Amino acid sequence: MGKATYTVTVTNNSNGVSVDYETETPMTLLVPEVAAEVIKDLVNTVRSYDTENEHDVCGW
Amino acid sequence: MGKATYTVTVTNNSNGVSVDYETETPMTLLVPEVAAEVIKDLVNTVRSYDTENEHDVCGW
Predict the structure, then answer these.
(1) CA–CA min distance A58, chain B (Å)
(2) CA distance B57 to B60
(3) Which of B3, B10, B19, B39 to mutate to test the interface with A (most CBs of A within 10 A)?
(4) CB B14 to CB A2 under 8 A?
(5) How far apart (Å, rounded) are the C-alpha atoms in residues B11 and B52?
(6) Are A7 and A39 in contact (CB under 8 A)?
(7) Considering only CB atoms, which chain A residues are within 8 Å of B20?
(8) Domains of chain A
């Protein structure tokens, strides 16, 4: 099993919220639009657990 | 114990290499220039181990 994939894990030490996402991106990793979306995607996901559930959205 | 920080890990399932980075970026996480560098930096670091040279641009 030798595929080209990447695992980006984003966790908040302030909220202690961990979030991992498997994304297979070669050069796209260097890409800002992709990296930004990834970083934001991860964060967006981390916050996703904050909003909707466990308390209603407010701060955000 | 109440600090604001984030843990972004980057592992290449293709090279089985992993790289973790602890950075404190609130809104920056959404920023592409920051995320791009964070994503590229992470990758650059992961690849850094692939290259004999272990000197990667990351503030100095």
Answers:
(1) 16
(2) 8
(3) B39
(4) yes
(5) 19
(6) no
(7) 9
(8) 1-60 (3.30.160.220)
Q: Which two three-digit tokens encode residue B55?
A: 């000197």
DSSP B55: -
Tell me how many degrees the CA angle A29-A35-A39 measures, rounded to the nearest 5: 130
Question: Phi, psi (5° rounding) for residue B54?
Answer: -115, 30
SS3 for A5-56 is CEEEEEEECCCCCEEEEECCCCHHHCCHHHHHHHHHHHHHHHHHCCCCCCCC
Do the Cβ atoms of A8 and B8 come within 8 Å? yes
Cα–Cα nearest to B18, from B43, B39, B55: B43
**Residue found by looking up tokens 């503030």 in the block:** B59
By what method was this entry solved?
A: NMR
